[PDB]
From a paper:
Men or mice with homozygous serine/threonine kinase 33 (STK33) mutations are sterile owing to defective sperm morphology and motility. STK33 is specifically required in male germ cells for spermatid differentiation, and Stk33 knockout male mice are sterile secondary to teratozoospermia and sperm immotility. STK33 is therefore considered a viable target with minimal safety concerns for contraception in men. To chemically evaluate STK33 for male contraception with STK33-specific inhibitors, we screened our multibillion-compound collection of DNA-encoded chemical libraries, uncovered potent STK33-specific inhibitors, determined the STK33 kinase domain structure bound with a truncated hit CDD-2211, and generated an optimized hit CDD-2807 that demonstrates nanomolar cellular potency (half-maximal inhibitory concentration = 9.2 nanomolar) and favorable metabolic stability.
There is a lack of available structures for STK33, which makes determining the molecular basis for our high-affinity STK33 inhibitors difficult. The STK33/CDD-2211 cocrystal contains one dimer per asymmetric unit, with each monomer showing clear density for bound CDD-2211. All residues in the construct are ordered except for a segment of the activation loop (residues 273 to 283 in chain A and 274 to 284 in chain B). As seen in other kinases with the exchanged activation segment conformation, the STK33 KD dimer is formed by the activation loop segment and the following two-turn helix with the APE motif from one monomer docking onto a surface formed between αE and αG helices of the other monomer. The biphenyl (BB3) binds to the outer lip of the active site near the hinge. It interacts with L122 and G123 on top and G198, E199, and M245 at the bottom through van der Waals interactions. The indazole (BB2) binds the ribose pocket and forms hydrogen bonds with backbones of E193 and C195 at the hinge region. The pyrrolidine with dimethyl amine (BB1) contacts the Mg2+ positioning loop, glycine-rich loop, and activation loop. The dimethyl amine forms a hydrogen bond with D265 that normally interacts with Mg2+. BB1 is shielded by F127 at the Gly-rich loop (top) and E242 and N243 at the catalytic loop (bottom), and it interacts with these residues through van der Waals interactions.
Residue numbers in the entry:
A (entry chain B): 99 to 273, 285 to 383
B (entry chain A): 100 to 272, 286 to 382
């Protein structure tokens, strides 16, 4: 159905339901603690955001994030169980991803196999296609968002990652006189969703290589690499990676969003199927 | 700066001004002619009913007022006063007796090359002012360019003292994951005003928009291709310099589209 938005008056009201545990992350987003349902003994993750620390700006952001998490339902988009709201704090009860962020796993593993990247990108492709079909653009897809809920080494000694997309604070839902409108305005309005595709292309590069596709010593020097967008292969690791994977890479990071592949086209690509 | 005077009711502002005929009406509210009883000066007052519009539409007018307060330019509309009753908001602005430029163009048909140069020169100065102060209009069109006075010169050519209005849509403008079109949008957000100048100049010379179609999708395809057709009979009398600046103001890529400061320095305006 729909997510309950329970309005309570202090932390003890929500502590009647859940046992609060250790802290899993902290930043400008608030803090995320482990929690255990006293009734069902199920493990959850509770994101506490202090409404009084962050002004009306970050609170209006948090309200759209909650509104988007309420309406989405997908196997690889984080599940919002309930929302509790005191006058001071706001609590987001979500499914627990015990294995942490994908960025931490990549840094400890080095890089991933082509099949392991294939599975992760397929999950990303399905979730991003779901969001785009519902007029939702993530706008901030990166390895620090992709949570991992469970792991599985199969018989091929290849790891299967059950990933979960999080952080919808920057997300937006899609919707002047036309004779006066400029081409880049038409492109930005008609291709407002293609930034998620670029992010999928970037994360696929980092899973295969272990380094970002563009890196520099200054911000601008980095921006210039992005505009050129020259995907550099010839590296020592690419020949054992199929040509079919490099074609979909080139399709995911077309500099022009006009010919950048779409989410639905991605799902139909032979590299994710066969 | 402009004081934001909070008053009680409509009779209170009618103590200051004598209200006259209505000059415009729409979703933006209504614009009346008004005369200061004390000073005898005529102004244009935009009355906005804070419930007839709405909260989404009231915040628009709040940013327009904040932008009109900080700008000062001989071809940007002057905001004299802002009065606020609990039910309405009043913007006292300098009166442009001659109305909108779109109405003048439709009645006249098209303009001479010198008449267009005077209009575009004023536009170029005003848009260069805004860009130099990091402000983008984003909605420049013939329906915005107000005309305060007209003057026929010795050559039987009209001199238009224009005023830019409607700033409601104006803006005061992890990296490794960022997409190219976002960098392009963040770096070239101001060039749309330049494209609007090119459109306005084409319509003043030609009398028709540079891109027109029977459907929106066909219209967008024309715009993204950006093909400038100078084949009509009135282009034969238009100098090559005017067509060159037209092609520069309507470069499809905003990266290669001429800037406001470069426009002011172009040979056609000098
Ligand atoms: C600012 N963004 C980058 C962060 C990314 C995650 N963010 C969350 O809000 C969030 C929402 C729902 C969640 N379900 N399970 C989560 C977890 C976890 C975890 C497990 C082991 C070790 C570390 C973490 C961890 C990592 C980063 C941040 C918090 C915890 C989880 C996290 C915002
Ligand atoms: C919705 N945009 C397209 C319209 C464009 C003008 N807009 C104004 O708000 C505004 C602000 C300050 C102003 N000073 N003098 C003005 C005038 C006038 C006038 C004179 C004769 C005949 C008609 C008009 C006229 C035309 C259109 C709208 C209102 C009045 C004036 C107008 C919004």
């Amino acid at each position: 159905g729909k997510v309950p938005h329970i309005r309570i008056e202090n932390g003890a009201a929500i502590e009647e339901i859940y046992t609060f545990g250790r802290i899993l992350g902290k930043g400008s987003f608030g803090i995320v603690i482990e929690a255990t349902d006293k009734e069902t003994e199920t493990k959850w993750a509770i994101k506490k955001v202090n409404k009084e620390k962050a002004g009306s700006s970050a609170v209006k952001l948090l309200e759209r994030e909650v509104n988007i998490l309420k309406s989405v339902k997908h196997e690889h988009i984080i599940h919002l169980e309930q929302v509790f709201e005191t006058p001071k704090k706001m609590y987001l009860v979500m499914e627990l991803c015990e294995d942490g962020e994908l960025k931490e796993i990549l840094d400890r593993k080095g890089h991933f196999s082509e099949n392991e990247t294939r599975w992760i990108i397929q999950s990303l492709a399905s979730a991003i296609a779901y969001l785009h079909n519902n007029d939702i653009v993530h706008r901030d897809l990166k390895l620090e968002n992709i949570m991992v809920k469970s792991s599985l080494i199969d018989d091929n000694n290849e790891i299967n990652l059950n990933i979960k997309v999080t952080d919808f604070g920057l997300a937006v839902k899609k919707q002047g006189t036309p004779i006066y409108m400029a081409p880049e305005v038409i492109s930005a309005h008609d291709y407002s969703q293609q930034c998620d595709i670029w992010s999928i292309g970037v994360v696929m590069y980092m899973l295969l290589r272990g380094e970002p596709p563009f890196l520099a010593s200054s911000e601008e020097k980095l921006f210039e690499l992005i505009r050129k967008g020259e995907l550099h292969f010839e590296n020592a690791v690419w020949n054992s990676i199929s040509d079919c994977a490099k074609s979909v890479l080139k399709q995911l990071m077309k500099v022009d969003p006009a010919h950048r592949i779409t989410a639905k086209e991605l799902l139909d690509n032979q590299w994710l199927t066969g």
